[PDB]
Structure 1
């Protein structure tokens, strides 16, 4: 089959510990995955049913 080629990403998906997670890491010793997401789900919108 004459394809011998695909396409993939060139760089890894970066993840960094921001301040909002850094406070929880410093105090409670736990970090959440992308706190921004859980905050946009829980505190910003009442329902936002999935």
Structure 2
């Protein structure tokens, strides 16, 4: 072997239902991953070619 250990994530990443996600969860029942990121890509700077 060239190594005996590898670094990595220690705990599971927490992806939780946030608040605007909770609103669209109750109303229509369809939750996206990153709702604030969709807001930043749509209603803040839509012309920004990401």
Tell whether the structures are fold-level matches, with TM greater than 0.5.
yes
Normalising by structure 1, report the TM-score. Answer: 0.86
Question: Residue 47 of structure 2: SS of its match in structure 1?
Answer: coil
Instruction: List gaps (5 residues or longer) in structure 1.
Output: none
Residues 1-50 of structure 1, C-alpha deviation per residue, up to 9 Å, x if partnerless? 34111111101111110110011010101111110110000000131102
Distance 2:30 2:46 in 1: 25
In terms of mean alpha carbon deviation, does 29-38 or 1-10 score higher?
Answer: 1-10
Distance 1:8 1:18 in 2: 26
Instruction: List gaps (5 residues or longer) in structure 2.
Output: none
Segments of 4+ moved more than 6 angstroms: none
**What does residue range 1-50 of structure 1 map to in structure 2 within 5 Å?**
1-50=1-50
